[model samples]
Target: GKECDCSSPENPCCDAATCKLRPGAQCGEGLCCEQCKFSRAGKICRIAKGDWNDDRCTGQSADCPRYH
Candidate 1:
């Protein structure tokens, strides 16, 4: 589901893009973003794969479902 930053010298997202944490999800276990694989809308250059499906990224706190 979440294809985090695992870009390699072979698998490149951009023509010469370097991966780094930006305005999207940062500092988490298994946190990944392959040159913006899961980035939110309007910010396709960054990651924003947080569960906010109901028109997410609308200036409101994200909400996700618990499987516990």
Candidate 2:
């Protein structure tokens, strides 16, 4: 599983040096971490519920389809 860090509200995306980016939380089903918050939205992307693989609290995003 991929390990991302989209925990910051201002930076709702992962680090380019480590994790891959997605569109939004919905695109992070088996991708995001357990610490991601699917309820909150950010400037670039929305927080995920972190319901991905063994990895937890990891989330990334490239671009969002809809604006927050």
Candidate 3:
């Protein structure tokens, strides 16, 4: 079944009954997402995976960049 509210990171529907997320909300998931908005640039969004490789927020995007 689908979620009643709009809080799901997969489906952000402001027109839903609950409307957990308000209009202009960037994303519900991601370290870069704070208060329904994108965080500052160069911010450490995701920690390193293997040895020393992490992801960061571009400040312009809602999600962090992929670890390369």
Candidate 4:
């Protein structure tokens, strides 16, 4: 489990205070961050699946996102 950018809007980590990328994953498909739903851990964030769009991660990356 990685850290979350507390300042980031809708951040899913730390209820009171929270804070904290990879590119080798590839250019088409990459690993993104997703938040775990719930109160504990304040919805901690973690590596998730997503499509690589414009060298960025997108949710439309094929079937359930890839690491490359």
For all candidates in order, the CA lDDT equals 0.32, 0.37, 0.61, 0.31
List model 2 lDDT by residue over 1-68, tens digit each: 44654443344444445554344443322232323334223332344445532312223432344222
Using TM-score as the measure, which candidate wins?
3
lDDT of 3 at 32: 76
List model 1 lDDT by residue over 4-68, tens digit each. 33344344432224443234543222222324344333322223356642332212222222321
Clashes of each: 3, 6, 0, 0
TM-score of 4: 0.19
Best by lDDT: 3
TM-score of 2: 0.19
Error of 3 at 61 (Å): 1.2
- Expressed as tens digits, the lDDT of each residue in 1-68 for candidate 3 is 26432356455534455545556775555667766666777878778866785677787765665665
When sorted by TM-score, best at the front, the candidate numbers are 3, 2, 4, 1
In TM-score terms, candidate 3 sits at: 0.51
lDDT of 1: 0.32
Q: RMSD in angstroms, candidate 4?
A: 13.5
Query: Can you give the TM-score per candidate against the true fold?
Result: 0.17, 0.19, 0.51, 0.19
- Candidate 3 segments whose C-alpha is farther than 4 A from its true place: 1-21, 50-53
